[PDB]
Design an enzyme around this catalytic site. Structure first.
Site, mmCIF file in Angstrom:
data_model
loop_
_atom_site.group_PDB
_atom_site.id
_atom_site.type_symbol
_atom_site.label_atom_id
_atom_site.label_comp_id
_atom_site.label_asym_id
_atom_site.label_seq_id
_atom_site.Cartn_x
_atom_site.Cartn_y
_atom_site.Cartn_z
ATOM 1 N N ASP A 58 -39.048 13.187 6.795
ATOM 2 C CA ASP A 58 -38.049 14.077 7.448
ATOM 3 C C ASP A 58 -36.912 13.400 8.728
ATOM 4 O OD1 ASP A 58 -36.439 16.566 7.567
ATOM 5 O OD2 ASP A 58 -37.890 17.599 9.159
ATOM 6 N N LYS A 70 -34.249 12.221 10.438
ATOM 7 C CA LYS A 70 -32.928 12.526 10.792
ATOM 8 C C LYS A 70 -32.973 12.663 12.335
ATOM 9 C CE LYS A 70 -34.348 17.422 10.299
ATOM 10 N NZ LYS A 70 -34.119 18.715 9.651
ATOM 11 N N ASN A 110 -34.752 15.117 14.622
ATOM 12 C CA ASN A 110 -36.060 14.832 14.843
ATOM 13 C C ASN A 110 -36.517 13.327 15.763
ATOM 14 O OD1 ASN A 110 -37.038 16.977 13.625
ATOM 15 N ND2 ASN A 110 -37.593 15.949 11.590
ATOM 16 N N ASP A 114 -42.035 16.026 14.966
ATOM 17 C CA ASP A 114 -42.158 16.647 13.847
ATOM 18 C C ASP A 114 -42.691 16.110 12.547
ATOM 19 O OD1 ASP A 114 -42.083 18.887 11.807
ATOM 20 O OD2 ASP A 114 -40.115 19.706 12.791
ATOM 21 N N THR A 143 -34.570 17.273 4.191
ATOM 22 C CA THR A 143 -33.223 17.749 4.618
ATOM 23 C C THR A 143 -32.420 17.108 3.822
ATOM 24 O OG1 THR A 143 -33.764 17.903 6.873
ATOM 25 C CG2 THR A 143 -31.534 18.033 6.719
#
EC number: 2.7.11.11
Lengths: 20, 349
Positions: free
Chosen positions: B165, B167, B170, B183, B200
């Site tokens: 994840d 991005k 985060n 996260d 995502t």
């Protein structure tokens, strides 16, 4: 322009994850 | 060759020292992985203050005055969304890993209604906010952050963890201007392949979208997306709706802003590579194809790890529990039921 297309996409804010 | 004797021996030595470090780090990880920590605090130890972004809120420890970011999970909702394993796994990972660019789990506990993970408070806010504010990062700026992600993934992958994840949302910026990855909700310990459609949309590798299984190389694809977005101000694949984003990803036709350096374009074509036999981070030379790429020629990998490089941007520090670097969110009361909920399912937390 690509930037203009980005603005028009509606995905300029925080993006949620997915889980399928 | 590209390197004289001195340079070749130095690089060889550096790469062997990485191996030595990762061997020790895996030994340490596996001890905590196999015997996780539990129940290191309780809720009445903290003052509630504000929501920062599951839900994460600023709290203050009543005895030390220290502030923390507390992730609160409603056990019933977690069950309803079939997230039991994800929430147990996230906590199990956080208590076992140790790296300077991973936000640390300071306490965890549970009660009749909720699960709580109390992490370091990172007051500089998300990279997302800073990137959208400035528009785009200069290549040296983007490179400084990218180097931290490269080292973090080198670490995680050595532990057979896939992050899944990456991005800007985060990535938090600490008081020294360094990155803190937050996260681990979608992270998974996998030694071979896995299949879950998760992450995502903008950051998904083609092989996540497609039915075929995938491996840790999806994180190196995601790094390519992140570097592109940091340097351009927008990601390489977007559209109004996720389905159209997926079509563009699987085609993989990437175009670049005219201000991207040639070195940057070459790196991104090798990270944003549909063909797994060709993608950097997935070849015989492993992470070294990335670390030794021309775009990273000025990067002192050890100095980044040691946090001795001067950061390009220091967030404004307005006080101990200041929140001016975060967005505002609606505030919910945090309710605790008189009856224990889903006890058996969350024994390990």
């Amino acid at each position: 322009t690509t930037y203009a297309d980005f603005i028009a996409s509606g995905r300029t804010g925080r993006r949620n994850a997915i889980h399928d | 060759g590209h390197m004289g004797n001195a340079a070749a021996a130095k690089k060889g030595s550096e790469q062997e020292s990485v191996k030595e470090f990762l061997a020790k780090a895996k030994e340490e990880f596996l001890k905590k992985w196999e015997s996780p920590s539990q129940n290191t605090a309780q809720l009445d130890h903290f003052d509630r203050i504000k929501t920062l972004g599951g839900r994460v809120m600023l709290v203050k420890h009543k005895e030390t005055g220290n502030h923390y970011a507390m992730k609160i999970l409603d056990k019933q909702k977690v069950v309803k969304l079939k997230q039991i394993e994800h929430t147990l796994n996230e906590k199990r990972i956080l208590q076992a890993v140790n790296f300077p660019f991973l936000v640390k789990l300071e306490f965890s506990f549970k009660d009749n209604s909720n699960l709580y993970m109390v992490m370091e408070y990172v007051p500089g806010g998300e990279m997302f906010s800073h990137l959208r504010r400035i528009g785009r990062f200069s290549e040296p700026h983007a490179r400084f952050y990218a180097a931290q992600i490269v080292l973090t993934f080198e670490y995680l992958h050595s532990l057979d963890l896939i992050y899944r994840d990456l991005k800007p949302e985060n990535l938090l910026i600490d008081q020294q201007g360094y990155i803190q990855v937050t996260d681990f909700g979608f992270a998974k310990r996998v030694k071979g392949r896995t299949w879950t459609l998760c992450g995502t949309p903008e950051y998904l590798a083609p092989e996540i979208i497609l039915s075929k299984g995938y491996n840790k190389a999806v994180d190196w694809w995601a790094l390519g997306v992140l570097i592109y977005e940091m340097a351009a101000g927008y990601p390489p694949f977007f559209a109004d709706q996720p389905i159209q984003i997926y079509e563009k990803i699987v085609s993989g036709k990437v175009r670049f802003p005219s201000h991207f350096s040639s070195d940057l374009k070459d790196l991104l074509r090798n990270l944003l590579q549909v063909d797994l036999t060709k993608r950097f981070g997935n070849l015989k030379n492993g992470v070294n194809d990335i670390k030794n790429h021309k775009w990273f020629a000025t990067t002192d990998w050890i100095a980044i790890y040691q946090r001795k490089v001067e950061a390009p941007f220091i967030p404004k520090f307005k006080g101990p529990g200041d929140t001016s670097n975060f967005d505002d969110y609606e505030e919910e009361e945090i309710r605790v039921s008189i009856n224990e909920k889903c006890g058996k399912e969350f024994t390990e937390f």
